[PDB]
C-alpha cells in the first residue's frame, strides 16, 4: 500500500526477505563477491525496518523497482565490471529496469561449483550455518539468473534439512550424499522445465501453450467446469508469459494473484487445496502447482454424446473452433489423468484434422463417424513402450537396463558423441527406475515429465555441435511429435564402422580402484565405442565380449599381483574379441 517495501517485509518475515534480497541481487550483480552482497542485504534490510516502523519515513513510498534500481546504480564499480549495464543507470524508471533485465547473463564464465568433502561441509555447516548456506545460496543464484527466486529458496531449505540431519548421523556420507544427488537432479529438471516452457511459448505460440494447459488443468481439476478451467488457462498463460519475460516482481504478483484467486474458489475448483491454501503467501502457488489430482466425478459419459452423434458438431465447431476443440481436450483430459499431456494433444489434433476435412464434405456425420477409432493406436504405442521398458527394466536392473539403452541408441545414431550417448542413456535409465515403480495409472505422466527435459537437453547439446540430421529432424519437429520421432529412429544403415583404435579399449588397475558412479562410466564409455567400431555385432556376440571383459577385469583385479596383467591379458581381448566380431 503506502509502502511496498514494508508490506513485503511484514508479509515475508525477516528471514525470507533477507534470502530473497540476496538472490535478487546475486542474479544481477553476478561478479560481486559474496561479502559485498551480505552488505547490501543488511542495508536493504535495515532500510526496510525503517519503513515497517513508519510507512511515512523518507523513500519508503517508492516502488520496489525504483528502490532496487537505485541501489543497483549505487555499486561503485558497476561500470568497471559490467560495462553496458552501467549505462542503464542513466535511464528513467520503466526503461531502466527493462534495460537491467536485458543485461542479465545466462551463461557467465564462472568455474563449476566443486562439492567439498562431506566432512568439510558438516564442519562448515556447524561452525557457521548462516554463512555456509547463504554463500551457497549466492553461488547458485549468480549462476542461474532466471531461476525463480522463491523456488530457489524452497530448494535452499531442503538443503538445510539435509545438512541438519545427516551431519550427526556418524555415517554422514551414506545419508547426505544421496540426498544431495537427489536434490541436484530435481534442481536440474526444474530449471530445464522452466526454459522448456518459455522457449515453447515463443517457438510455438500462445495457442499451443493454452492447449497444453487445458489438458494439464483438466486432469488436475476434473470436477471444475470447462469455463473455470478456461479462466484458469487464461491466467496461467499471462503468468508464464510474464515470468518468462523475466521480471521477478511482476512474475511474483501474477503468481500470487492466481493463487489467491484459486483459494477463494476452492469449491469451484478442487477439494484437494485446503492444505496449500492455508500456507504462507510465499509457498502458496508453488504448493498448488504441486497438488495431487482431484478424484474425478465417478460416473461420466462417453464423449460420443457431444462429439460424434449430436447434430451441430460442425456447427458448434465452426462457431468457435478453438473453444470447441478446447472442450473436447477438457472432457478427454479430465477422464484420463493416466495419459501424458502430449498424448491428449495428439488426440485433439486428430479430432481437429477430422472435423476440418469432414465438416466441409458431403455428409459430415458419415465421414467423421469413425474418429474415435483413430485414437486407439495413438493411445497404445506409448502404453506399450511403458509395458516393455518397465519389464525389460525388471529383468536387467537399473545399470544393465542403462547398458541395453546404450546399445540401442548407439546403433540408431552412431554419429553422436560417446559422452552424449552415455549421459543420455544414463538419464533415460534413471527415468525408467523412477517412473516404472509407479502403477500403470501414473506411469505415462511420469515419463512425459522427464523425457521432455532429457530430450531437450540432448537437442540443445546437439544444436551447437550438429552431428546427425535425423536427431535434428526430431529436434525441430512439433513438441508433440518429438518423442514419437526419436522412438521412430531405426538402426543406421549408411554408417561405416569406426576405424579401430587400441588406446580406446585399453584398461588399467586404476579402474579396480575407481568408484561405482565412475567405473560404470568408463565401462559404458567403452561399450559405446565397441558398438561404434562393430555396429553389426549381435546380442550374443556382444554378450560374449561383455562377459570376457568382466572376467578380464576380475582376473586383473582379484587374486593377482595386478598392473602387468592388464596389458598382457588386455591384448588378449582387443584381438580375441576383434576376431569374434570380424
Ligand X SMILES: CCCCCCCCCCCCCC(=O)OC[C@@H](O)COP(=O)(O)OCC[N+](C)(C)C
Site for ligand X in 457-496 (CB under 6 A): 458, 478-480, 482-483, 486-487
Coil, strand or helix: which one is 396? coil
Burial 332-345 (b: 16+ CB within 10 A, else e): bbbbbbbbbbbbbb
Contact 317/359 with Cβ under 8 angstroms?
Answer: yes
Candidate segments 299-307, 312-320, 356-364, 449-457, binder of ligand X by CB under 6 A: 449-457
Q: Which three cell numbers mark 95?
A: 526503461
Residues in 336-355 that interact with ligand X by CB under 6 A: 340, 342-343, 345, 348-349, 352
Task: Using the minimum distance from each CB to ligand X, give the nearer residue, 40 or 85.
Answer: 40
Task: Using the minimum distance from each CB to ligand X, give the nearer residue, 367 or 489.
Answer: 489
Candidate segments 41-49, 83-91, 308-316, 363-371, binder of ligand X by CB under 6 A: 41-49
Q: In terms of Cα–Cα distance, which of 318, 347, 313 is closest to 330?
A: 347
C-alpha dihedral (516, 519, 520, 526), degrees to nearest 10: 180
257 annotated as belonging to a binding site for a ligand: yes
Contact 468/415 with Cβ under 8 angstroms?
Answer: yes
Q: Which three cell numbers mark 409?
A: 541408441
**Angle in degrees, 0-180, between the axes of helices 516-533 and 539-555, rounded to the nearest 10:** 140
Contact 324/316 with Cβ under 8 angstroms?
Answer: yes
Contact 118/164 with Cβ under 8 angstroms?
Answer: no
Task: Using the minimum distance from each CB to ligand X, give the nearer residue, 86 or 385.
Answer: 385
Q: How far is the CB of 299 from ligand X (least distance, A)?
A: 25
Count, residues near ligand X per rule CB under 6 A: 119
286 annotated as belonging to a binding site for a ligand: no
Contact 565/556 with Cβ under 8 angstroms?
Answer: yes
**Which of 3, 6, 21, 313 is the binder for ligand X (CB under 6 A)?**
21
Sign of the four-CA dihedral 180, 183, 189, 194 = negative
Q: Is 193 in the site for ligand X (CB under 6 A)?
A: yes
Q: Is 407 in the site for ligand X (CB under 6 A)?
A: no
Residues in 505-524 that interact with ligand X by CB under 6 A: 505, 523
Q: How far is the CB of 83 from ligand X (least distance, A)?
A: 23
**Which of 49, 103, 104, 197 is the binder for ligand X (CB under 6 A)?**
197
Residue with cell 596389458: 567
Per-position x/- string for 80-109, each x denoting binding to ligand X as judged by CB under 6 A, each - no binding: ------------------------------
**Which of 26, 32, 78, 259 is the binder for ligand X (CB under 6 A)?**
259
Q: How far is the CB of 94 from ligand X (least distance, A)?
A: 16
Contact 505/574 with Cβ under 8 angstroms?
Answer: yes
Q: Is 29 in the site for ligand X (CB under 6 A)?
A: no
560 annotated as belonging to a binding site for a ligand: no
Q: Which residues are annotated as a binding site?
A: 1, 4, 11, 65, 238, 242, 245, 247, 250, 253, 257
Amino acid at each position: 500500500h503506502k509502502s511496498e517495501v514494508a508490506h513485503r517485509f511484514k508479509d515475508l518475515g525477516e528471514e525470507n526477505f533477507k534470502a530473497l534480497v540476496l538472490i535478487a541481487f546475486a542474479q544481477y550483480l553476478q561478479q560481486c563477491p559474496f561479502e559485498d552482497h551480505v552488505k547490501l542485504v543488511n542495508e536493504v534490510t535495515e532500510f526496510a525496518k525503517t519503513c515497517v516502523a513508519d510507512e511515512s519515513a523518507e523513500n519508503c513510498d517508492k516502488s520496489l523497482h525504483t528502490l532496487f534500481g537505485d541501489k543497483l546504480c549505487t555499486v561503485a564499480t558497476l561500470r568497471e565490471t559490467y560495462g553496458e549495464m552501467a549505462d542503464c543507470c542513466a535511464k528513467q524508471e520503466p526503461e531502466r529496469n527493462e534495460c537491467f533485465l536485458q543485461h542479465k547473463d545466462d551463461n557467465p564464465n564462472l568455474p563449476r561449483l566443486v562439492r567439498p568433502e562431506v566432512d568439510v561441509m558438516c564442519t562448515a555447516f556447524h561452525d557457521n550455518e548462516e554463512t555456509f548456506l547463504k554463500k551457497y545460496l549466492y553461488e547458485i543464484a549468480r549462476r542461474h539468473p532466471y531461476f525463480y527466486a522463491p523456488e530457489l529458496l524452497f530448494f535452499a531449505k531442503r538443503y538445510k534439512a539435509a545438512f541438519t540431519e545427516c551431519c550427526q548421523a556418524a555415517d554422514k556420507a551414506a545419508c547426505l550424499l544421496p540426498k544431495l544427488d537427489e536434490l541436484r537432479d530435481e534442481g536440474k529438471a526444474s530449471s530445464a522445465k522452466q526454459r522448456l516452457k518459455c522457449a515453447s511459448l515463443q517457438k510455438f505460440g500462445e495457442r499451443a501453450f493454452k492447449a497444453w494447459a487445458v489438458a494439464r488443468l483438466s486432469q488436475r481439476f476434473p470436477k471444475a467446469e470447462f469455463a473455470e478451467v478456461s479462466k484458469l488457462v487464461t491466467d496461467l498463460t499471462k503468468v508464464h508469459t510474464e515470468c518468462c519475460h523475466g521480471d521477478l516482481l511482476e512474475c511474483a504478483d501474477d503468481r500470487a494473484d492466481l493463487a489467491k484467486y484459486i483459494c477463494e474458489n476452492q469449491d469451484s475448483i478442487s477439494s484437494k487445496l485446503k492444505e496449500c491454501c492455508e500456507k504462507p503467501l510465499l509457498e502458496k502457488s508453488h504448493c498448488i502447482a504441486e497438488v495431487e489430482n482431484d478424484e474425478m466425478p465417478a460416473d461420466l459419459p462417453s464423449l460420443a454424446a457431444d462429439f460424434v452423434e449430436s447434430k451441430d458438431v460442425c456447427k458448434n465447431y465452426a462457431e468457435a473452433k478453438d473453444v470447441f476443440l478446447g472442450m473436447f481436450l477438457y472432457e478427454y483430459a479430465r477422464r484420463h489423468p493416466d495419459y501424458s499431456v502430449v498424448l491428449l494433444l495428439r488426440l485433439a489434433k486428430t479430432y481437429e484434422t477430422t472435423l476440418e476435412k469432414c465438416c466441409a464434405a458431403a455428409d459430415p456425420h458419415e465421414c467423421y463417424a469413425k474418429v474415435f477409432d483413430e485414437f486407439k493406436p495413438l493411445v497404445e504405442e506409448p502404453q506399450n513402450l511403458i509395458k516393455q521398458n518397465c519389464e525389460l527394466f525388471e529383468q536387467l536392473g537399473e545399470y544393465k537396463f542403462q547398458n541395453a539403452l546404450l546399445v540401442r541408441y548407439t546403433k540408431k545414431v552412431p554419429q553422436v558423441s560417446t559422452p552424449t550417448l552415455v549421459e543420455v542413456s544414463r538419464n533415460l535409465g534413471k527415468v525408467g527406475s523412477k517412473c516404472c515403480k509407479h502403477p500403470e495409472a501414473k506411469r505415462m505422466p511420469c515419463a512425459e515429465d522427464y523425457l521432455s527435459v532429457v530430450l531437450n537437453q540432448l537437442c540443445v547439446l546437439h544444436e551447437k555441435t550438429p552431428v546427425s540430421d535425423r536427431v535434428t529432424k526430431c529436434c525441430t519437429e512439433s513438441l508433440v511429435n518429438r518423442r514419437p520421432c526419436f522412438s521412430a529412429l531405426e538402426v543406421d544403415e549408411t554408417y561405416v564402422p569406426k576405424e579401430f583404435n587400441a588406446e580406446t579399449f585399453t584398461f588399467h588397475a586404476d579402474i579396480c580402484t575407481l568408484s561405482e558412479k565412475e567405473r560404470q562410466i568408463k565401462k559404458q564409455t567403452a561399450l559405446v565405442e565397441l558398438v561404434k567400431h562393430k555396429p553389426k555385432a549381435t546380442k550374443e556376440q556382444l554378450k560374449a565380449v561383455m562377459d570376457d571383459f568382466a572376467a578380464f577385469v576380475e582376473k586383473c583385479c582379484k587374486a593377482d599381483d595386478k598392473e602387468t596383467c592388464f596389458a598382457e591379458e588386455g591384448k588378449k581381448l582387443v584381438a580375441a574379441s576383434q576376431a569374434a566380431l570380424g
